Structure 1
Amino acid sequence: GLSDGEWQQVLNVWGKVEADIAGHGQEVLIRLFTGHPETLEKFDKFKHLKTEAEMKASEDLKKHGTVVLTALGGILKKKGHHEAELKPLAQSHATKHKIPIKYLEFISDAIIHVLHSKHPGDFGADAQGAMTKALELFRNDIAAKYKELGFQ
């Protein structure tokens, strides 16, 4: 569980994301799909994208990036009280979309990467750690719902 100061650092960093949610969303998904090509393969609507240039040109990928980070913002603002988001997201991601927990780790790595690549001057090591802990908390809670379902 995060401290009050850790949550405050998480949500302060998140303010930077909200100044350009679309640009953030696009860069996180590009980082994910290029760094871990298996992840792109799970997304039927984006698997036609073959280069970084095609990815950057897709208005739909940019939209989806906005939708995903907006949903993540919603979760982070609950400061761990996100139980109501767990079954639905685990259910869509485990059951509908067959997304391993490992891929959730990859997008967490991507978020941290893109956050540091844009906000060097805020997202110092301590803020990185707090953000990592917030992302890990959500993933750990999703993992228990994957285990409940027997996902493989």
Structure 2
Amino acid sequence: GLSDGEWQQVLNVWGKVEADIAGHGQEVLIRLFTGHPETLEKFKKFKHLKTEAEMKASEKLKKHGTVVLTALGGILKKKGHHEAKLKPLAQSHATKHKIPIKYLEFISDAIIHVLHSKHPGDFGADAQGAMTKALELFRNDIAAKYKELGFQG
């Protein structure tokens, strides 16, 4: 779905993430939860966090941020051949935690927002378009697996 140049733009900005993956992950989750509070309800560990300030002080939230962006990074680095890396993630988010595709769109938006905020010089208009396409491919392929797994997403 993406050109070689588009994947380069994706992996270029992703390199910036790997220098502070916990900080990025924290900011992504806080953007998600504050922008779409219904998503917070999915997390038994975190839904007690009422405010952005409480979220920022949570070590466990930050650690989960690391887990999320580590998994996403592994998937992005597989470019268009990401099915093997994506498979276990689709499975867990269709069974252990049922996460609607809409919420994956919300976190996609959050990722794009955080990347634009922290690395604008590596995330101009075209790079943002490339990442948008990469995260769309991600959601589309998860959705396809969801259905096989019997989850309407």
TM-score of Structure 1 vs Structure 2, range by shorter chain: over 0.9
Match of 2:68 in 1: 68
CA offset at residue 63 of structure 1? 0.6
Residues 28 and 110 of structure 1 are in contact (CA less than 8 Å); yes or no, is this contact kept in structure 2? Answer: yes
CA offset at residue 5 of structure 1? 0.6
Residues 28 and 107 of structure 2 are in contact (CA less than 8 Å); yes or no, is this contact kept in structure 1? Answer: yes
Question: Which secondary structure does the structure 1 equivalent of 2:121 belong to?
Answer: coil
Counterpart-to-counterpart distance in 1, 2:88 and 2:121: 36
Give per-residue Cα distances to partners, 1:40-67, cap 9 Å, x unaligned. 0001011110111110000010011011
CA offset at residue 81 of structure 1? 1.1
CA offset at residue 71 of structure 1? 0.8
| TM, length-normalised to structure 2 | 0.96
Question: Which secondary structure does the structure 1 equivalent of 2:120 belong to?
Answer: coil
CA offset at residue 74 of structure 1? 0.6
Question: Which secondary structure does the structure 2 equivalent of 1:6 belong to?
Answer: helix
Match of 2:130 in 1: 130
* RMSD of equivalent CA atoms: 0.9
**Number of aligned residue pairs:** 152
CA offset at residue 87 of structure 1? 2.9
Give per-residue Cα distances to partners, 1:83-124, cap 9 Å, x unaligned. 112331111101111110111110000000000011112210
Q: Alignment identity in percent?
A: 98
Residues 22 and 63 of structure 1 are in contact (CA less than 8 Å); yes or no, is this contact kept in structure 2? Answer: yes
Residues 74 and 85 of structure 2 are in contact (CA less than 8 Å); yes or no, is this contact kept in structure 1? Answer: no
Residues 75 and 86 of structure 2 are in contact (CA less than 8 Å); yes or no, is this contact kept in structure 1? Answer: no
Residues 86 and 145 of structure 1 are in contact (CA less than 8 Å); yes or no, is this contact kept in structure 2? Answer: no
Residues 80 and 138 of structure 1 are in contact (CA less than 8 Å); yes or no, is this contact kept in structure 2? Answer: no
Counterpart-to-counterpart distance in 1, 2:58 and 2:70: 19
Residues 10 and 134 of structure 2 are in contact (CA less than 8 Å); yes or no, is this contact kept in structure 1? Answer: yes
CA offset at residue 133 of structure 1? 0.6
Residues 14 and 73 of structure 1 are in contact (CA less than 8 Å); yes or no, is this contact kept in structure 2? Answer: yes
Counterpart-to-counterpart distance in 2, 1:18 and 1:90: 23
Moved more, 76-85 or 33-42: 76-85
